[PDB]
Amino acid sequence: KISTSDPVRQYLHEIGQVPLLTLEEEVELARKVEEGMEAIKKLSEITGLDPDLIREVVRAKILGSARVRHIPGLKETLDPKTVEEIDQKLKSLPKEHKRYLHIAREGEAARQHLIEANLRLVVSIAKKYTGRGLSFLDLIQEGNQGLIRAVEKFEYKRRFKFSTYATWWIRQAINRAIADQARTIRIPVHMVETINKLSRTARQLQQELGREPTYEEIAEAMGPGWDAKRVEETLKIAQEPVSLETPIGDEKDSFYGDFIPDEHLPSPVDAATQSLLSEELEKALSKLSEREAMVLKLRKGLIDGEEVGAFFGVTRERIRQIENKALRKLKYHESRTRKLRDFLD
């Protein structure tokens, strides 16, 4: 039906059935996650297999079958045979190393469990970064990606609990998201804060003047290197775009995009232009010396805009010689049979 309620209920229900106890359950899971790490690494050590490989195979056995490997990541790990081979060496690990295998999985599980339980934490957090320009679910989701990030770095050895830790690792993920996706035309985090400061400043300035600050105040109040050109520029970037599809004039049925003209497209006038221009330019180009005319025709009309580098083997003196003498005979006879005079442009 309506999407917020369902997810809210979705995780709230699972937290309702499994909140994590203050100390115990978070400690427990934590301990298991770490041992997983130490396990996987020691597994990498005895198998010669990359900790990335050991990590994804235990994931498949605990989080999902061939189905989760095939659709998400296209196909480099054979759905069946590949991961299985890897699990076989894990079994071969005697009593000593097999232990790490068994631990790794159990650790991987605990992880997910801690992640599940601390989902209310995200939503409670994400709840306040609401009106920034991101959808509540989008916001919770990035924040969620943030809590997962925290899970990777928390050191249970250092007594502090995951609550305060997740807080930071989530708030960072959210704010970033807000700064990276909120706008159509991307704006770096610095410009963002920049814009917030500009706004806030305009606020304290509205406080007493009764005059929406000329871009003079804003510069001053802002600080060190702020000037009129800077503020006029930032607020110009601050305006989000406008909907090309917007109700125009008497909103009856007006759509903003039929009114903008087009520039690359040669309106008829221009197609006729290039027709005569090219035909006449082509006529002159033929009844001539192909030594310095084509040089300046090709150097100017074919590739890019170098007198010396313009002519093949013959130096500058023959360039300027034929350039200026042929360019003038061409112009002065074109002065006779006036065809070019009427500036095609």
Partner 1 sequence: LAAWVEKEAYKPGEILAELPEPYLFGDKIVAAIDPEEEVIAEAEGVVHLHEPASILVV
198 binds, among Mg ion, partner 1, none (CB under 5 to 8 A by kind): Mg ion
Name which of 84 and 106 has its Cβ closer to partner 1. Answer: 106
From 103-111, 135-143, 172-180, 314-322, span contacting Mg ion (CB under 5 A): 314-322
Residues 101 to 140 in contact with Mg ion, rule: CB under 5 A: 131
Assigned token pair, 50: 């990359």
Name which of 109 and 248 has its Cβ closer to Mg ion. Answer: 248
287 binds, among Mg ion, partner 1, none (CB under 5 to 8 A by kind): Mg ion
Assigned token pair, 204: 């304290």
- Assess contact for 86 and 48: CB atoms under 8 A: no
78 binds, among partner 1, Mg ion, none (CB under 5 to 8 A by kind): none
- DSSP label at residue 292: T
CB of 87 to partner 1, least distance (A): 23
Residues 2 to 61 in contact with partner 1, rule: CB under 8 A: 21-24, 27
Instruction: Please give the Cα distance from 223 to 221 (Å, whole number).
Output: 6
Instruction: Please give the Cα distance from 116 to 120 (Å, whole number).
Output: 9
The contact mask relative to partner 1 for 146-175 (x = CB under 8 A, - = no) is ------------------------------
Largest Cα separation within the chain, whole Å, is 103
Q: Count Cβ neighbours within 10 Å for each residue of 24-61 and write b for 16 or more, e otherwise.
A: ebbbbbbebbbbbeebbebbbeebebeeebbbbbbbbb
Chain positions contacting Mg ion, by CB under 5 A: 27, 38, 42, 74, 80, 131, 198-200, 249, 265, 267, 279, 287, 293, 296-299, 304, 312, 321, 325-326, 329
